[PDB]
Design a protein around this nucleic acid. Sequence first.
DNA 1: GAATTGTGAGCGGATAACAATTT
DNA 2: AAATTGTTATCCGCTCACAATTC
Lengths: 62, 62
Amino acid sequence: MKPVTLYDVAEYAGVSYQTVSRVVNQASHVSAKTREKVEAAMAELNYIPNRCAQQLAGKQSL
Amino acid sequence: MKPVTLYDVAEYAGVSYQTVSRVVNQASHVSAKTREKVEAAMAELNYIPNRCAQQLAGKQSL
DNA sequence: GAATTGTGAGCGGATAACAATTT
DNA sequence: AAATTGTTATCCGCTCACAATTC
């Protein structure tokens, strides 16, 4: 109930939603500054991956 | 687990993914000929209808 | 015109690459 | 050149629309 998208995390962090995909997967081209902000945002919004959209798009991850 | 998609069923029945979805949904534009072929094909590969994808495809609502 | 069947695009989301800027 | 950040395009099982064919 009331999930959190990777979009919410980006919006709060003040970065592009792709910046999250980066920290989540391609840590490359991701400075510690931005990385730390995204990681912290995951707790702020209480990031709960879109079980429907993620499983669909190709990111079930258990 | 093998997440069989409507494409896998359509490929087995020799139909379209739209046809498969029409059979799974049981709404309109579906003939009994293809319906019984899709229900049979989805039984071979053990197709699991994704309700999450359905919610998304039909515009994720609250 | 509607139904049937197939193809294309979108839903809302994510992933990857490219261009520009900084170091 | 490499790293960093933002942006565009494509992909995902499913649904809708469009196109073609048949009724």
